[PDB]
Amino acid sequence: YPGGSTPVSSANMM
Amino acid sequence: AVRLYRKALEVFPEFAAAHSNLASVLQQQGKLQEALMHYKEAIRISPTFADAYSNMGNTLKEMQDVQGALQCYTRAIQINPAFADAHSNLASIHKDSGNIPEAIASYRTALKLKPDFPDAYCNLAHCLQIVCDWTDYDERMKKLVSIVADQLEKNRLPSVHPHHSMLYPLSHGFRKAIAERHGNLCLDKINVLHKPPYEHPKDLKLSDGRLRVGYVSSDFGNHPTSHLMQSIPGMHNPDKFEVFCYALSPDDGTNFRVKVMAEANHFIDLSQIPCNGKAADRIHQDGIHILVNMNGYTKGARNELFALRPAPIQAMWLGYPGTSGALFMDYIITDQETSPAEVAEQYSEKLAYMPHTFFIGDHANMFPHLKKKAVIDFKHIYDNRIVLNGIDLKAFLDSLPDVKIVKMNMPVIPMNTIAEAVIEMINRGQIQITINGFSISNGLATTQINNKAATGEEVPRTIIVTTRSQYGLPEDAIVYCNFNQLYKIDPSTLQMWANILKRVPNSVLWLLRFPAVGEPNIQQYAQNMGLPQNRIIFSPVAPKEEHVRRGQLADVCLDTPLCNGHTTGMDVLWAGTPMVTMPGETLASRVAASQLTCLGCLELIAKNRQEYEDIAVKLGTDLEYLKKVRGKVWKQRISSPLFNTKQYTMELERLYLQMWEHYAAGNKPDHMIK
Ligand SMILES: O=c1ccn([C@@H]2O[C@H](COP(=O)(O)OP(=O)(O)O)[C@@H](O)[C@H]2O)c(=O)[nH]1
Ligand SMILES: *[C@@H]1O[C@H](CO)[C@@H](O)[C@H](O)[C@H]1NC(C)=O
């Protein structure tokens, strides 16, 4: 969120 | 290779190409610091050696030196402006940093220079997905499929990431194959350790009759994973289970990490053990019977640990909505709705069914203040225009005269002096007020009152007010919502939503700036579909607690068929909001229907697009029916198994013991689907 952080599910580097 | 290279340098120290080649190999081996030394030699010997700068940038990226990587890619492009690879590498830095427009621009330059460039085209396709740019969408999808087909045929690692493969019209066969190739990257990496297979436990004697279960995750901390399962380790039965949590990430200081560390029988910080061989040795030393992969192909994964097979049974669980494609994973924990036996072929793993849904959420523990609500009648009586929630809400209500209880039980505060003061706080943008000694907080201001409550680390200790006016939602119309990242939307989905909006005059669609740069694209496509700007309302992404709480303001949630809400689906249901879904074929497209089936709301599951539209429109127009379904969700989020973490843990334990007894009897993994 603006001013903070909202972690989400995301891909690993390849 | 390395010993031969070093000899060539002992013979001829000024061999630029050789240094740059030796560095690349060292890089592949994971010896990043050693690789750096040789890239530096290469660029000293030849100050115009663009390829070395670019490859050095790759190494810095892997060392988590993003700024250094960017500098290298920048030098490479300065030396050779037509260097397509360097442009693509720069684009990836922009992408990973969240600057999608700049990423898009750099990938387009890469493709202009080298039109046949699978990595750049597929990475560009994902960027475009993220911001809902659907220019030439059908042709784009065809090209992605063609690229994957070619790469699979030619034995090259596909340019489509397995996590992203759910978003494109690839065959299940192709999707599994992409995953399998990633599984093999892991095997290749650990094969070089030349470690023998581990000797596994054959009974539970050494563990006093307890099954040792190891949960491996990079997401023990502030992340959806912990928001879903942080209560599970502490709910395991210590008479029958010994719980080991293996963290792949350092301690982020949050209460989520505190809880798991406090409640697991053992907690091991593998972030301090970079070597996968040593880390696997540690897991094996602990005597784990069932090792649970909570990452799959997601950020922070160390699937090399599983490729080494330190435990006799290894299962995929919860964190990754797809198959690993990998022979070293034995089971995927799922359910009959999510993964019907008919599609077992989509998965490399054997299916292991939980009885209702494999999905779980910690909402009853994180957000207990949302178990009950009251409203303020600011005029009929609505359940979602002005809402109050709080641990002490009942005591507050008891201090007021003329509170009415509406039955089908929802307390209603009449329009009086108290109600006006609450409404004025909202209108004025004030943070909080006091009424009869009770703390009444503006729901937009949670970070200013208790930041730990805002993030879900603590339960709020004040009474919170949530209103349609806080978000610019109409007081006199139906609100359809979808709180997912915008990448989950596709053209067919927005068309469906537009069709619904056109059939329900008095309605709006509520979406998030997730990211904000997707907003103008959705709005343009909506306009092309004939919807004026005011039919779709955007809000910013919110702190976790506000996001879950504000779902109470919607009438109906319209789930994304391409990839459903997962965490996001649980969030909406906890607010009591009916969710309309159309389950597809992939796991990721079937999760919401599984949640709804467990909840007990079969009438919200559509078999096709016309039914999805018809269900959504019925909810938006048949107001008695809407009241009935909302009532059903509100009650069943408590009475159903959906949010019951103790029941879930016990069912998980039953499943584990079935897996173990099967192994202990001398059998290789088989489906556990009864
Ligand atoms: O305004 C918002 C919207 C979402 N979320 C959270 O953001 C995450 C979204 O992650 P993801 O897209 O990976 O969710 P999923 O695919 O599991 O539905 C979830 O934890 C949500 O609860 C949030 O905190 N505020
Ligand atoms: C996000 O993470 C949660 C918990 O790990 C997981 O259940 C969900 O499937 C993830 N979302 C996607 C789209 O991968």
XYZ file of C-alpha atoms and ligand atoms in Angstrom:
727
model
C 0.000 0.000 0.000
C 1.210 3.552 -0.637
C 3.515 4.538 2.208
C 3.982 0.905 3.186
C 4.229 -2.506 1.565
C 1.804 -5.179 0.433
C 3.513 -8.538 -0.104
C 2.037 -10.769 -2.809
C 2.606 -14.199 -4.355
C 5.215 -13.935 -7.109
C 7.533 -15.954 -9.340
C 11.107 -16.859 -8.475
C 14.001 -15.620 -10.610
C 15.142 -17.849 -13.478
C 36.903 -26.575 -17.319
C 37.897 -24.371 -14.382
C 41.275 -26.055 -13.863
C 41.956 -25.818 -17.602
C 40.927 -22.162 -17.706
C 43.117 -21.211 -14.736
C 46.067 -22.854 -16.485
C 45.368 -20.767 -19.589
C 45.562 -17.680 -17.372
C 48.756 -18.980 -15.775
C 50.033 -19.156 -19.354
C 48.428 -16.046 -20.857
C 47.041 -13.581 -18.255
C 45.820 -11.116 -20.916
C 43.145 -13.344 -22.463
C 39.958 -11.259 -22.235
C 37.611 -13.759 -23.873
C 38.973 -16.507 -21.620
C 38.458 -14.524 -18.420
C 34.902 -13.706 -19.470
C 34.248 -17.376 -20.255
C 35.744 -18.619 -16.981
C 33.639 -16.069 -15.074
C 30.446 -17.276 -16.741
C 31.167 -20.870 -15.728
C 32.034 -19.850 -12.177
C 28.747 -17.932 -12.154
C 26.839 -21.070 -13.147
C 28.527 -22.877 -10.246
C 27.268 -20.310 -7.746
C 30.757 -18.943 -7.118
C 29.658 -15.366 -7.698
C 32.517 -13.536 -5.961
C 35.090 -15.527 -7.937
C 33.195 -14.833 -11.159
C 33.288 -11.099 -10.420
C 37.104 -11.146 -10.320
C 37.303 -12.483 -13.876
C 34.678 -10.189 -15.394
C 36.682 -7.280 -13.964
C 39.865 -8.548 -15.628
C 38.037 -8.940 -18.940
C 36.779 -5.336 -18.945
C 40.153 -3.908 -17.940
C 41.894 -5.713 -20.800
C 39.208 -4.463 -23.208
C 37.261 -1.315 -22.191
C 34.800 -1.825 -25.067
C 33.891 -5.411 -24.135
C 30.107 -4.958 -23.907
C 29.315 -8.663 -23.513
C 31.460 -8.875 -20.391
C 29.717 -5.854 -18.872
C 26.345 -7.448 -19.536
C 27.289 -10.813 -18.063
C 28.910 -9.107 -15.082
C 25.587 -7.330 -14.568
C 23.853 -10.710 -14.430
C 26.223 -11.808 -11.676
C 25.668 -8.652 -9.622
C 21.915 -9.157 -10.004
C 22.252 -12.640 -8.511
C 24.333 -11.183 -5.651
C 21.405 -8.849 -4.951
C 23.385 -5.809 -6.103
C 20.642 -4.274 -8.244
C 22.263 -0.868 -8.651
C 25.567 -2.462 -9.680
C 23.767 -4.629 -12.220
C 22.014 -1.608 -13.659
C 25.352 0.193 -13.996
C 26.805 -2.748 -15.907
C 23.842 -3.040 -18.262
C 24.009 0.719 -18.782
C 27.698 0.568 -19.749
C 27.008 -2.340 -22.108
C 24.329 -0.316 -23.921
C 26.589 2.746 -24.108
C 29.378 0.694 -25.652
C 26.977 -0.996 -28.075
C 23.557 0.670 -28.451
C 22.429 -2.228 -30.654
C 23.123 -4.863 -27.985
C 19.677 -6.473 -27.688
C 20.549 -8.705 -24.724
C 21.698 -5.747 -22.617
C 18.467 -3.861 -23.308
C 16.453 -6.903 -22.217
C 18.557 -7.283 -19.075
C 18.011 -3.611 -18.203
C 14.275 -4.065 -18.802
C 14.282 -6.906 -16.261
C 15.803 -4.611 -13.620
C 13.050 -2.098 -14.313
C 10.446 -4.889 -14.155
C 11.658 -6.410 -10.883
C 11.794 -2.883 -9.459
C 8.142 -2.219 -10.307
C 8.742 0.324 -13.092
C 6.670 -1.406 -15.762
C 6.483 1.404 -18.346
C 10.280 1.617 -18.398
C 10.546 -2.178 -18.583
C 8.108 -2.230 -21.503
C 10.108 0.444 -23.323
C 13.400 -1.434 -22.899
C 11.942 -4.794 -23.978
C 10.480 -3.127 -27.074
C 13.935 -1.781 -27.933
C 15.375 -5.278 -27.438
C 12.769 -6.749 -29.790
C 13.295 -3.978 -32.356
C 16.985 -4.929 -32.455
C 16.369 -8.686 -32.338
C 12.797 -9.613 -33.382
C 13.379 -13.300 -32.555
C 14.062 -13.028 -28.820
C 11.921 -15.402 -26.682
C 13.042 -14.139 -23.248
C 12.269 -10.528 -24.152
C 8.973 -11.293 -25.870
C 7.691 -13.418 -22.986
C 8.877 -10.954 -20.345
C 7.198 -8.158 -22.292
C 4.008 -10.251 -22.422
C 4.018 -10.525 -18.638
C 4.600 -6.777 -18.248
C 1.640 -6.133 -20.510
C -0.473 -8.567 -18.483
C 0.405 -6.742 -15.264
C -0.929 -3.415 -16.558
C -3.842 -4.875 -18.568
C -2.491 -3.751 -21.939
C -4.329 -6.119 -24.282
C -3.145 -4.690 -27.595
C -3.120 -7.538 -30.143
C -3.975 -9.889 -27.275
C -5.162 -12.889 -29.291
C -2.080 -12.802 -31.549
C 0.168 -12.354 -28.510
C -1.258 -15.488 -26.872
C -0.763 -17.471 -30.086
C 2.867 -16.345 -30.261
C 3.542 -17.270 -26.614
C 2.176 -20.749 -27.249
C 4.288 -21.042 -30.401
C 7.437 -19.944 -28.559
C 6.954 -22.486 -25.767
C 6.280 -25.235 -28.318
C 9.523 -24.397 -30.145
C 11.606 -24.225 -26.977
C 10.261 -27.526 -25.656
C 11.006 -29.181 -28.993
C 14.541 -27.789 -29.078
C 15.267 -28.770 -25.479
C 15.655 -25.227 -24.156
C 14.367 -23.846 -20.845
C 11.079 -22.186 -21.769
C 10.881 -18.388 -21.597
C 7.476 -18.598 -19.929
C 7.829 -18.970 -16.155
C 5.791 -21.852 -14.706
C 3.995 -19.487 -12.308
C 2.920 -17.328 -15.254
C 1.930 -20.276 -17.440
C -1.499 -20.298 -15.776
C -2.264 -16.982 -17.525
C -1.838 -18.148 -21.124
C -3.840 -20.650 -23.235
C -1.162 -23.342 -23.054
C -2.215 -26.995 -22.995
C -2.014 -28.805 -19.655
C 0.681 -30.909 -21.272
C 2.748 -27.825 -22.070
C 2.217 -26.339 -18.626
C 3.375 -29.527 -16.930
C 6.350 -29.686 -19.293
C 7.397 -26.123 -18.434
C 7.276 -27.014 -14.741
C 9.228 -30.219 -15.338
C 12.045 -28.282 -17.026
C 12.332 -26.072 -13.939
C 12.361 -29.129 -11.721
C 15.339 -30.263 -13.793
C 17.275 -27.038 -13.254
C 17.165 -27.987 -9.560
C 18.317 -31.578 -10.134
C 21.205 -30.377 -12.310
C 22.275 -27.939 -9.598
C 22.388 -30.590 -6.875
C 23.782 -33.379 -9.084
C 27.134 -31.572 -9.002
C 27.316 -32.086 -5.227
C 27.566 -35.820 -5.947
C 25.756 -36.553 -2.686
C 24.546 -40.119 -2.128
C 20.837 -40.714 -1.523
C 19.808 -40.255 2.100
C 18.829 -43.194 4.289
C 15.272 -42.462 5.411
C 13.500 -43.461 8.637
C 11.380 -46.609 8.248
C 9.262 -46.236 11.385
C 8.453 -43.787 14.181
C 10.389 -45.546 16.954
C 13.217 -42.998 17.218
C 10.675 -40.185 17.400
C 8.644 -41.770 20.211
C 5.792 -42.622 17.845
C 5.508 -39.078 16.495
C 5.493 -38.153 12.816
C 8.146 -35.526 12.166
C 6.772 -32.980 9.707
C 8.946 -30.260 8.221
C 7.391 -27.122 6.742
C 9.802 -25.344 4.370
C 8.960 -21.746 3.462
C 10.554 -18.422 2.532
C 7.342 -16.788 3.768
C 7.332 -17.140 7.563
C 6.778 -13.451 8.161
C 4.609 -10.761 6.549
C 3.354 -12.568 3.439
C 0.086 -14.222 2.305
C 1.474 -17.639 3.301
C 1.626 -16.733 6.997
C -1.681 -14.835 6.782
C -3.182 -18.193 5.810
C -1.395 -20.783 7.953
C 0.431 -19.141 10.884
C -1.833 -20.941 13.381
C -1.315 -24.430 11.974
C 2.068 -25.359 13.528
C 0.755 -24.586 17.033
C -2.411 -26.608 16.447
C -0.623 -29.858 15.662
C -1.164 -32.628 18.244
C 2.159 -33.097 20.101
C 1.287 -36.690 21.065
C 1.385 -37.708 17.393
C 3.393 -35.013 15.562
C 6.667 -33.146 15.974
C 6.716 -29.944 13.937
C 9.870 -28.500 12.365
C 9.629 -25.179 10.538
C 12.491 -24.466 8.113
C 12.703 -20.782 7.242
C 14.303 -19.784 3.941
C 14.158 -16.095 4.857
C 15.698 -14.023 7.651
C 13.502 -12.764 10.514
C 11.560 -9.733 9.248
C 10.648 -8.583 12.762
C 6.909 -9.184 12.396
C 4.502 -10.963 14.749
C 3.856 -13.545 12.033
C 7.438 -14.745 12.368
C 7.238 -14.472 16.173
C 4.177 -16.740 16.282
C 5.557 -19.547 14.134
C 8.898 -19.464 15.977
C 7.043 -19.663 19.303
C 4.597 -22.430 18.436
C 6.555 -24.854 16.252
C 8.357 -27.591 18.174
C 11.543 -26.566 16.350
C 12.379 -23.591 14.181
C 15.450 -23.646 11.936
C 16.743 -20.593 10.075
C 18.079 -21.984 6.797
C 18.618 -18.440 5.512
C 21.877 -18.747 7.486
C 22.862 -21.878 5.563
C 23.231 -20.862 1.872
C 24.591 -24.255 0.809
C 21.757 -26.553 -0.265
C 23.807 -29.652 0.536
C 24.468 -28.549 4.107
C 20.868 -27.365 4.495
C 19.558 -30.715 3.244
C 21.932 -32.461 5.662
C 20.372 -30.471 8.481
C 16.850 -31.517 7.482
C 17.916 -35.141 7.213
C 19.641 -34.922 10.605
C 16.347 -33.838 12.178
C 14.787 -37.090 10.970
C 11.892 -35.607 8.982
C 9.281 -38.067 7.706
C 7.221 -35.653 5.598
C 8.833 -32.535 4.135
C 6.345 -29.936 2.894
C 7.181 -27.585 0.027
C 5.371 -24.299 0.611
C 7.042 -22.336 -2.212
C 7.003 -24.233 -5.478
C 8.129 -21.787 -8.167
C 7.725 -18.621 -6.103
C 10.135 -15.976 -4.816
C 12.556 -17.289 -2.201
C 12.212 -20.946 -3.199
C 15.077 -23.359 -2.638
C 13.671 -26.391 -4.406
C 17.185 -27.802 -4.553
C 16.530 -28.897 -0.949
C 13.718 -31.146 -2.174
C 15.716 -32.360 -5.183
C 18.206 -33.818 -2.669
C 15.359 -35.865 -1.127
C 16.261 -35.598 2.587
C 12.837 -37.043 3.518
C 10.976 -40.177 2.351
C 7.752 -38.297 1.606
C 7.722 -34.822 0.080
C 4.509 -32.884 -0.534
C 3.488 -29.619 -2.212
C 1.179 -27.534 0.000
C -0.715 -24.264 -0.209
C 1.930 -21.812 -1.402
C 2.057 -22.646 -5.111
C -1.133 -23.055 -7.195
C 0.277 -25.486 -9.736
C 2.259 -28.660 -10.298
C 5.989 -28.824 -9.603
C 6.326 -31.153 -12.574
C 9.183 -32.634 -10.546
C 9.764 -36.316 -9.793
C 11.197 -35.433 -6.372
C 7.776 -34.209 -5.207
C 5.529 -37.142 -4.252
C 2.173 -35.520 -3.494
C 0.223 -32.353 -3.996
C -2.185 -31.510 -1.189
C -5.423 -30.435 -2.841
C -9.089 -31.504 -2.917
C -11.707 -33.043 -5.194
C -13.161 -29.661 -6.236
C -9.823 -28.030 -6.980
C -8.268 -31.073 -8.665
C -10.860 -33.663 -9.724
C -9.464 -37.148 -10.306
C -10.206 -36.742 -14.024
C -7.361 -34.240 -14.411
C -4.732 -36.141 -12.434
C -2.694 -35.979 -15.669
C -2.189 -32.211 -15.326
C -0.013 -32.981 -12.283
C 3.312 -34.767 -11.908
C 2.473 -35.444 -8.241
C -0.014 -37.949 -6.868
C -3.172 -36.211 -5.616
C -3.735 -36.100 -1.853
C -7.197 -34.873 -0.931
C -8.199 -32.821 2.044
C -11.894 -33.532 2.696
C -13.323 -30.085 1.905
C -10.868 -27.567 0.501
C -7.070 -27.513 0.721
C -7.383 -23.745 1.164
C -7.255 -22.242 4.672
C -7.013 -18.760 6.177
C -6.116 -17.331 9.580
C -8.904 -14.731 9.481
C -10.750 -15.940 12.582
C -7.546 -15.326 14.575
C -6.280 -12.220 12.737
C -9.578 -10.388 12.286
C -11.967 -11.487 15.058
C -13.362 -7.957 15.238
C -15.111 -8.723 11.926
C -17.087 -11.681 13.337
C -19.876 -9.265 14.220
C -20.987 -5.874 12.918
C -23.477 -3.095 13.505
C -24.762 -0.435 11.108
C -25.948 3.159 11.305
C -29.279 3.898 9.649
C -28.481 7.227 7.990
C -31.984 7.763 6.587
C -34.640 1.334 4.313
C -31.922 -0.443 6.304
C -28.692 -1.409 4.520
C -26.079 -3.817 5.831
C -23.154 -2.263 3.962
C -23.308 1.541 3.830
C -22.059 2.533 7.289
C -20.557 -0.294 9.304
C -19.019 -0.596 12.757
C -16.772 -3.422 13.994
C -14.962 -3.905 17.296
C -14.062 -6.327 20.060
C -15.969 -4.001 22.404
C -18.784 -3.145 20.012
C -21.437 -4.846 22.122
C -20.534 -2.765 25.187
C -20.709 0.358 23.009
C -24.124 -0.631 21.669
C -25.331 -1.280 25.229
C -24.473 2.328 26.170
C -26.821 3.703 23.505
C -30.575 4.210 23.662
C -32.861 3.149 20.812
C -30.639 0.476 19.247
C -32.801 -1.804 17.102
C -31.997 -5.452 16.390
C -32.853 -6.546 12.853
C -33.564 -10.255 12.354
C -33.667 -12.770 9.497
C -29.134 -10.476 14.082
C -27.782 -7.100 13.000
C -27.800 -4.181 15.450
C -28.878 -0.882 13.914
C -28.048 2.530 15.383
C -30.763 5.116 14.557
C -30.065 8.556 13.087
C -29.443 10.570 16.252
C -26.833 12.821 17.867
C -24.414 9.892 18.222
C -24.838 8.852 14.581
C -24.272 12.420 13.393
C -20.987 12.705 15.302
C -19.719 9.486 13.731
C -20.718 10.700 10.276
C -19.055 14.095 10.837
C -15.765 12.429 11.770
C -15.875 10.634 8.433
C -16.891 13.689 6.432
C -14.210 15.835 8.092
C -11.482 13.217 7.697
C -10.821 13.160 11.442
C -8.776 10.231 12.813
C -10.933 9.282 15.801
C -13.564 10.450 18.294
C -14.857 9.408 21.715
C -18.463 8.481 22.446
C -19.617 7.412 25.906
C -15.972 6.724 26.736
C -15.526 4.362 23.783
C -12.818 4.841 21.129
C -14.330 5.288 17.655
C -11.750 5.198 14.858
C -11.899 6.289 11.236
C -11.195 3.127 9.217
C -9.040 5.128 6.757
C -6.659 6.110 9.543
C -5.615 2.796 11.080
C -1.900 3.288 10.407
C -2.010 6.493 12.470
C -3.692 4.765 15.428
C -1.990 1.369 15.598
C 0.214 0.355 12.706
C 0.478 -3.258 13.935
C -3.324 -3.507 13.858
C -3.330 -2.042 10.344
C -1.060 -4.826 9.028
C -2.851 -7.632 10.829
C -0.034 -8.227 13.367
C -2.338 -7.223 16.258
C -6.115 -7.235 16.694
C -7.465 -3.672 16.723
C -8.374 -2.444 20.204
C -10.732 0.336 19.115
C -14.134 0.361 17.412
C -13.694 1.044 13.684
C -16.077 2.804 11.285
C -16.194 1.815 7.590
C -18.330 3.638 5.032
C -19.054 3.699 1.322
C -18.271 7.433 1.479
C -14.652 6.722 2.488
C -14.155 5.223 -0.980
C -16.543 7.280 -3.099
C -18.972 4.379 -3.572
C -22.636 5.177 -4.316
C -25.074 4.989 -1.387
C -27.956 3.983 -3.657
C -26.570 1.326 -5.979
C -25.168 -2.205 -6.138
C -21.415 -2.519 -5.597
C -19.620 -5.359 -7.386
C -15.998 -5.756 -6.297
C -12.790 -7.490 -7.227
C -9.754 -6.832 -5.080
C -7.186 -8.884 -7.011
C -4.012 -7.723 -8.690
C -5.106 -6.533 -12.131
C -2.934 -9.105 -13.940
C -5.672 -11.682 -13.221
C -8.085 -9.864 -15.565
C -8.249 -10.622 -19.288
C -10.353 -9.203 -22.144
C -13.045 -11.886 -21.865
C -13.352 -11.223 -18.117
C -13.796 -7.471 -18.493
C -16.368 -8.063 -21.260
C -18.328 -10.302 -18.866
C -18.195 -7.624 -16.185
C -19.290 -4.978 -18.680
C -22.223 -7.192 -19.654
C -23.252 -7.441 -16.002
C -22.941 -3.682 -15.460
C -25.094 -2.996 -18.524
C -27.853 -5.291 -17.215
C -27.804 -3.718 -13.729
C -28.283 0.054 -14.291
C -27.937 0.907 -10.673
C -24.427 -0.546 -10.162
C -20.659 0.015 -10.085
C -17.558 -2.162 -10.257
C -14.980 -1.564 -7.520
C -11.344 -2.333 -8.457
C -7.906 -1.540 -7.016
C -4.894 0.408 -8.307
C -2.900 -2.794 -8.306
C -0.969 -1.336 -9.983
C -2.209 2.184 -10.661
C -0.756 2.117 -14.202
C -3.348 -0.534 -15.081
C -6.211 1.850 -14.284
C -6.086 3.855 -17.539
C -6.030 0.654 -19.612
C -9.064 -0.882 -17.885
C -10.879 2.427 -18.212
C -10.143 2.698 -21.944
C -11.341 -0.848 -22.627
C -14.435 -0.230 -20.487
C -15.160 2.903 -22.534
C -14.750 0.933 -25.758
C -17.306 -1.520 -24.367
C -19.700 1.386 -23.885
C -19.354 1.959 -20.134
C -18.953 5.554 -18.947
C -16.071 6.312 -16.566
C -18.345 6.420 -13.524
C -19.305 2.750 -13.782
C -15.890 1.673 -12.450
C -14.453 3.069 -9.231
C -10.802 2.601 -8.262
C -9.315 2.602 -4.747
C -5.688 2.420 -3.589
C -4.279 -0.819 -2.225
C -4.806 -0.718 1.555
C -3.122 -2.088 4.671
C -4.192 -5.695 5.246
C -6.822 -5.085 7.937
C -8.509 -2.227 6.026
C -8.577 -4.350 2.875
C -10.416 -7.183 4.623
C -12.695 -4.836 6.554
C -13.719 -2.744 3.567
C -15.000 -5.817 1.723
C -18.042 -5.443 3.988
C -19.089 -2.447 1.843
C -19.585 -4.456 -1.334
C -22.745 -6.339 -2.300
C -21.103 -9.028 -4.462
C -17.559 -10.033 -5.463
C -16.971 -10.970 -9.089
C -14.114 -13.484 -9.144
C -11.552 -13.562 -11.969
C -11.914 -16.783 -14.007
C -8.386 -16.706 -15.489
C -6.721 -17.022 -12.093
C -9.077 -16.735 -9.112
C -8.617 -14.859 -5.890
C -6.873 -17.273 -3.537
C -5.862 -15.366 -0.416
C -8.050 -12.643 -1.851
C -11.023 -15.021 -2.043
C -10.687 -15.876 1.648
C -10.478 -12.170 2.431
C -13.746 -11.351 0.684
C -15.635 -14.285 2.196
C -14.554 -13.329 5.722
C -16.340 -9.998 5.209
C -19.534 -11.920 4.376
C -19.473 -10.992 0.692
C -20.872 -13.496 -1.822
C -18.367 -14.319 -4.547
C -19.417 -15.361 -8.068
C -16.931 -17.668 -9.789
C -16.489 -19.736 -12.947
C -14.040 -22.574 -12.328
C -11.714 -23.424 -15.195
C -9.308 -26.286 -15.774
C -6.105 -25.173 -14.062
C -5.715 -25.366 -10.285
C -5.398 -21.573 -10.080
C -8.731 -21.151 -11.865
C -10.639 -23.532 -9.548
C -9.675 -22.373 -6.054
C -12.612 -20.007 -5.525
C -15.144 -22.702 -6.451
C -13.457 -25.006 -3.911
C -13.737 -22.306 -1.243
C -17.429 -21.780 -2.069
C -18.160 -25.501 -2.052
C -16.643 -25.843 1.426
C -18.539 -22.759 2.540
C -21.785 -24.324 1.268
C -22.714 -21.902 -1.537
C -23.050 -24.017 -4.684
C -25.417 -21.469 -6.243
C -22.506 -19.039 -6.720
C -20.519 -21.387 -8.975
C -21.052 -20.894 -12.728
C -20.646 -23.580 -15.391
C -20.134 -21.098 -18.238
C -19.987 -17.372 -18.965
C -23.717 -16.899 -19.478
C -24.393 -18.498 -16.084
C -21.770 -16.282 -14.422
C -23.484 -13.206 -15.862
C -26.941 -14.501 -14.923
C -25.906 -15.265 -11.325
C -24.225 -11.886 -10.937
C -27.258 -10.067 -12.370
C -29.731 -11.985 -10.211
C -27.736 -10.972 -7.127
C -27.711 -7.383 -8.340
C -31.444 -7.174 -9.042
C -33.332 -9.683 -6.865
C -32.750 -7.938 -3.548
C -34.482 -10.545 -1.368
C -32.283 -13.167 -2.978
C -29.202 -10.994 -2.347
C -30.187 -10.692 1.322
C -30.585 -14.476 1.557
C -27.182 -15.248 -0.027
C -25.313 -12.595 1.978
C -26.947 -14.042 5.088
C -25.784 -17.498 4.070
C -22.163 -16.367 3.616
C -22.186 -14.369 6.861
C -23.326 -17.388 8.888
C -21.403 -20.090 7.064
C -17.998 -18.427 7.321
C -18.368 -19.418 11.005
C -20.332 -22.678 10.858
C -18.576 -24.233 7.817
C -15.068 -25.712 7.886
C -13.665 -22.914 5.678
C -11.967 -20.786 8.372
C -11.705 -23.511 11.035
C -7.969 -23.845 11.489
C -8.216 -26.545 14.195
C -10.427 -28.741 12.022
C -8.119 -28.122 9.065
C -5.001 -29.093 11.033
C -6.691 -32.274 12.236
C -7.663 -33.214 8.689
C -4.117 -32.457 7.539
C -2.870 -34.792 10.281
C -5.184 -37.587 9.112
C -3.820 -37.145 5.588
C -0.187 -37.198 6.770
C -0.765 -40.457 8.628
C -2.344 -42.012 5.533
C 0.726 -40.976 3.540
C 3.040 -42.391 6.175
C 1.240 -45.706 6.664
C 1.290 -46.160 2.870
C 5.060 -45.601 2.766
C 5.750 -47.657 5.882
C 3.933 -50.594 4.273
C 6.484 -50.513 1.448
C 4.449 -48.710 -1.213
C 5.529 -45.943 -3.564
C 3.210 -42.897 -3.583
C -0.323 -43.357 -4.920
C -3.371 -41.078 -5.050
C -5.034 -40.510 -1.680
C -8.495 -39.585 -2.967
C -11.050 -41.345 -0.755
O -5.887 -3.628 -0.743
C -5.342 -4.707 -0.554
C -5.467 -5.748 -1.478
C -4.844 -6.962 -1.190
N -4.141 -7.107 -0.027
C -3.411 -8.356 0.243
O -2.524 -8.496 -0.844
C -2.207 -9.863 -1.037
C -2.422 -10.179 -2.521
O -1.572 -11.265 -2.855
P -1.894 -12.211 -4.106
O -2.227 -11.380 -5.270
O -0.732 -13.109 -4.347
O -3.216 -12.953 -3.559
P -3.863 -14.345 -4.038
O -3.372 -14.688 -5.395
O -3.505 -15.398 -3.078
O -5.334 -14.094 -4.034
C -3.132 -10.650 -0.108
O -2.421 -11.044 1.051
C -4.218 -9.639 0.235
O -4.841 -9.842 1.483
C -4.009 -6.077 0.870
O -3.357 -6.226 1.914
N -4.619 -4.883 0.605
C -0.231 -16.322 -3.164
O 0.223 -16.960 -1.979
C -0.739 -17.771 -1.347
C -0.156 -18.320 -0.044
O 1.170 -18.760 -0.286
C -1.112 -18.909 -2.291
O -2.080 -19.748 -1.688
C -1.673 -18.324 -3.578
O -1.983 -19.381 -4.469
C -0.668 -17.359 -4.196
N -1.253 -16.719 -5.372
C -0.831 -17.017 -6.609
C -1.639 -16.478 -7.760
O 0.173 -17.699 -6.825
